Design an enzyme around this catalytic site. Structure first.
Site, PDB file in Angstrom:
ATOM      1  N   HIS B 121       0.856  -0.963  -0.120  1.00 48.92           N
ATOM      2  CA  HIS B 121      -0.293   0.447   0.236  1.00 48.92           C
ATOM      3  C   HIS B 121       1.045   1.432   0.232  1.00 48.92           C
ATOM      4  O   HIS B 121       2.374   1.187   0.016  1.00 48.92           O
ATOM      5  CB  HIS B 121      -0.981  -0.366   0.788  1.00 48.92           C
ATOM      6  CG  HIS B 121      -2.172  -1.140   0.484  1.00 48.92           C
ATOM      7  ND1 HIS B 121      -2.970  -0.971   0.461  1.00 48.92           N
ATOM      8  CD2 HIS B 121      -1.929  -2.241   1.318  1.00 48.92           C
ATOM      9  CE1 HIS B 121      -3.781  -1.762   0.413  1.00 48.92           C
ATOM     10  NE2 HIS B 121      -3.254  -2.178   1.135  1.00 48.92           N
ATOM     11  N   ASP B 151      -1.092   6.715  -2.839  1.00 56.83           N
ATOM     12  CA  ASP B 151      -1.967   7.020  -3.939  1.00 56.83           C
ATOM     13  C   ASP B 151      -2.342   8.261  -4.945  1.00 56.83           C
ATOM     14  O   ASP B 151      -2.148   7.765  -5.574  1.00 56.83           O
ATOM     15  CB  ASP B 151      -2.291   6.207  -2.921  1.00 56.83           C
ATOM     16  CG  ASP B 151      -2.839   5.167  -2.096  1.00 56.83           C
ATOM     17  OD1 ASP B 151      -1.863   4.067  -2.688  1.00 56.83           O
ATOM     18  OD2 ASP B 151      -3.155   4.566  -1.750  1.00 56.83           O
TER      19      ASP B 151
END
Lengths: 354, 355
Positions: B121, B151
């Site tokens: 992540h 992200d």
């Protein structure tokens, strides 16, 4: 010139904030970028650029600037609202000499409203829109995420999207326009995930008590035996289980992953596990793993990471490593950035452009 | 449809995190966005979308999907490298039905190399390129800046840059191509300023010892008398000076702004000053100021800030407030986002898109 924005002609009015970052990136992808500095460089943010001198307060400078802007596709400026207008370089003045121009305005607070003339920096823009309150541990005052979130992520990056969005529009209308890029707006969209999760009860305003803010024992950093750190991002249960097995912890003797009432206990257990070996151990254990465990590298160590090296994420300059352009393209690849091109005379550039 | 990206056609292969953010912004600015989900199945990140379902494994699903893609300008996918190939939706398979398509691949690690198949992540991608180390206080372990830097900032936004830059190339070549957006890459460029400064001796790897990392007393938050916070960002000496004056502090009783050796002593003094009054007090005192002092607002309070309200940075939606599109455009202005368009059948879209 190499990359997918070969052709594109950009005039950049020298200022401080994010505006250069956006200009750098266009240059990075092969755009033709001329920056007008005052008369009066080792900053590697000024790569992929020709620099020229021009006093814009002058009559001669305003004339020569408006000439460049004439035969070009994009202008970038990041002065406060009003400055370009009073200089005689504002939108209207520019449209008169080139109705194809993309007029790009990089500010924090926006072109209007009560804060529009207030000075500020990254940390101020993210203070007002909720972002900064949400960064940091709960027992600590909020921590600035450098200037990544306002200046670049919610700033320059949106300037760029706006520019290139506008260039798309211009293919089907013949006309330029003004791109209004405010850090306070862009950063708010950047964090749209949190605004959404708030509405579904899936994110609180309590700092350091969320899945992604460091409150989850499985989404955080851990100190190792050598005092260096690893990152853990094992959100999904299958990755979490993998992480536990590699730590030598038996799931049946731990609280549930997402019983938030017992996170203290869970953090205690993971903390002791991770502290019993140095960072490099964990990096090796969890290589090729889906455990979501990675070593937390300092800038200086990044040149030794196999996955950084083999993908050429960085290139060498004078004074050391710098990032290669991003993203990448299959056919029209970007290329190693060139240094800033020492003062050309603004004349010689005008020759060059038709 | 409203905005600079009117009648850009975009096919989104359902995934999580970065890819949909990119898809959202393209829609936000009025692109025509079709999201193929799984038949298996109020995330406002799915706004400005038409949704269609399609098992991409079945023979029929893969044909319907390839028929959309043929009538489209952009494809977004955020699966592991190799996954779309195996499904037969890969770059080469798509350039057979559409030499014009922009093929947008959104990963963390990139398309090749040692970590390419590794799950991760945000916190993982930024851990490897120096970023995450540089964030947080010096006497504490690094803190993740939510997932804003990997992200989105270094992720979706570079995908968008790449998509739109590739459309510009498509105009003087007539051909599409693959955009390879890796978060480990984008976030590295996102932080180019720090790499720059490192090179000129103007940034250390030491945490909480830098101009912008919270170490500088003039670029940090402070607790107020009511336990709420203000942000200070008075980098330039003229702004700092204005700040001191509003604090009621005599510059010549204080160590130099940029004597790093004395920052803890300077910070001790500013801390006491700010502690002496509550947040709203400082916000009023420093209004219209150039002191670079702002209240640190919690999300729940943001709807009450004049500068927010007056500029319509947010719109109200079923639930709570949501950001309006950014950036803004003079002529082809974005409109207020529409919720997601309930489970359309993929045939209906195919009629509508020429046919």
């Amino acid at each position: 010139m190499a990359g997918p924005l070969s052709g594109l002609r950009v005039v950049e009015l020298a200022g401080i904030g994010p505006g250069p970052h956006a200009a750098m990136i266009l240059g990075d992808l092969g755009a033709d970028v001329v920056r007008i500095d005052r008369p009066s460089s080792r900053d590697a943010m000024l790569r992929n650029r020709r620099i020229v001198t021009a006093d814009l307060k002058s009559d001669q400078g305003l004339e020569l600037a408006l000439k460049l802007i004439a035969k070009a596709d994009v202008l970038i400026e990041g002065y406060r609202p009003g400055v370009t207008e009073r200089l005689g370089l504002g939108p209207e003045e520019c449209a008169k000499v080139n109705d194809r121009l993309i007029y790009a305005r990089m500010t924090g607070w926006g072109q209007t409203g009560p804060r529009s003339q207030q000075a500020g920096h990254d940390i101020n823009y993210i203070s007002l829109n909720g972002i900064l309150h949400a960064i940091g541990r709960g027992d600590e005052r909020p921590v600035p995420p450098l200037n990544l979130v306002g200046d670049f992520g919610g700033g320059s990056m949106f300037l760029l999207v706006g520019i290139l969005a506008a260039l798309w529009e211009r293919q089907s209308s013949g006309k330029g326009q003004v791109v209004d890029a405010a850090m306070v707006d862009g950063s708010s969209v950047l964090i749209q995930m949190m605004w959404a999760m708030r509405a579904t009860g899936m994110w609180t305003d309590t700092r350091g008590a969320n899945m992604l803010d460091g409150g989850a024992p499985y989404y955080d950093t851990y100190e190792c035996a050598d005092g260096r750190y690893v990152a853990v991002g094992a959100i999904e249960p299958q990755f979490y289980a993998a992480m536990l097995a590699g730590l030598g912890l038996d799931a049946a003797e731990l609280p549930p992953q997402n019983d938030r009432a017992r996170w203290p206990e869970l953090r205690a257990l993971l903390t002791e596990a991770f502290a019993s070996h140095d960072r490099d151990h964990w990096g090796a254990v969890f290589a090729n793993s889906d455990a979501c465990v990675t070593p937390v590298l300092a800038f200086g160590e990044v040149h030794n990471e196999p996955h950084i090296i083999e993908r050429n994420t960085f290139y060498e300059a004078n004074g050391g490593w710098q990032p290669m352009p991003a993203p990448r393209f299959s056919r029209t690849a970007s290329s190693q950035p060139r240094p800033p091109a020492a003062t050309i005379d603004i004349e010689a550039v005008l020759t060059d452009w038709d």
